[PDB]
Amino acid sequence: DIMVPSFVYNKLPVIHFLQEKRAEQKLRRVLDETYTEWTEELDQAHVTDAITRSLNI
Amino acid sequence: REEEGLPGGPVPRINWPQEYSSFIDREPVVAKRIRYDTLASTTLERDEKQIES
């Protein structure tokens, strides 16, 4: 009725702070893993060159 | 360009009368004319619907 309640009440602030920091860390890790992937596609000049060769030019 | 009626393919900026005078033998000159004339008579276009698909 007296002791354990008081010590729990004393614990609350530090635990709240640490859990907030942990959530911020999770969000930071989520953001840090985001990279924009620039894809590379076959240049159409080679396609045009192959078209010309097929014409026997 | 298609609406106007000009050739679809690119056409180089050349003056073949000068080229004939420059070169000694007609064979390379005639070959060049054959290639460009063939190129200007072809449409270097693809169907971009299938390509995108």
Structure token pair of residue A27: 């969000």
In single-letter form, the type of residue at position B15 comes to N
Between CA A6 and CA A14 the distance in angstroms is 14
Q: Do A51 and B44 touch (CB under 8 A)?
A: yes
Cα–Cα distance between B7 and B18 in angstroms, integer?
23
d(CA B9, CA B44): 6
Contacts of A48 in chain B (CB under 8 A): 44
Close Cβ partners of A51 (under 8 Å, ≥ 6 residues apart): B44
The DSSP 8-state label assigned to residue B41 in this structure reads T
Look up residue B3 and give its DSSP letter.
T
In total, chain A counts a number of residues equal to 57
Q: Output the CA–CA distances (angstroms, integers) from residue A38 to A35, A41, A47, B34, in the order listed.
A: 9, 10, 21, 42
- Technique used: cryo-EM
Which helix or strand (DSSP H or E) is residue A26 part of? helix A3-32
Residues A57 and B39: beta-carbon distance below 8 Å: yes
Q: Between chain A and chain B, how many beta carbons pairs sit less than 8 Å apart?
A: 11
Q: Are B39 and A56 in contact (CB under 8 A)?
A: no
Chain A residue closest to B51 (CA)? A44
3-state secondary structure of B16: helix
Long-range contacts of B8-13 (CB under 8 A, 24+ apart): B8/B42, B8/B43, B8/B44, B8/B45, B9/B39, B9/B40, B9/B41, B9/B42, B9/B43, B9/B44, B10/B39, B10/B40, B10/B44, B11/B36, B11/B40, B12/B36
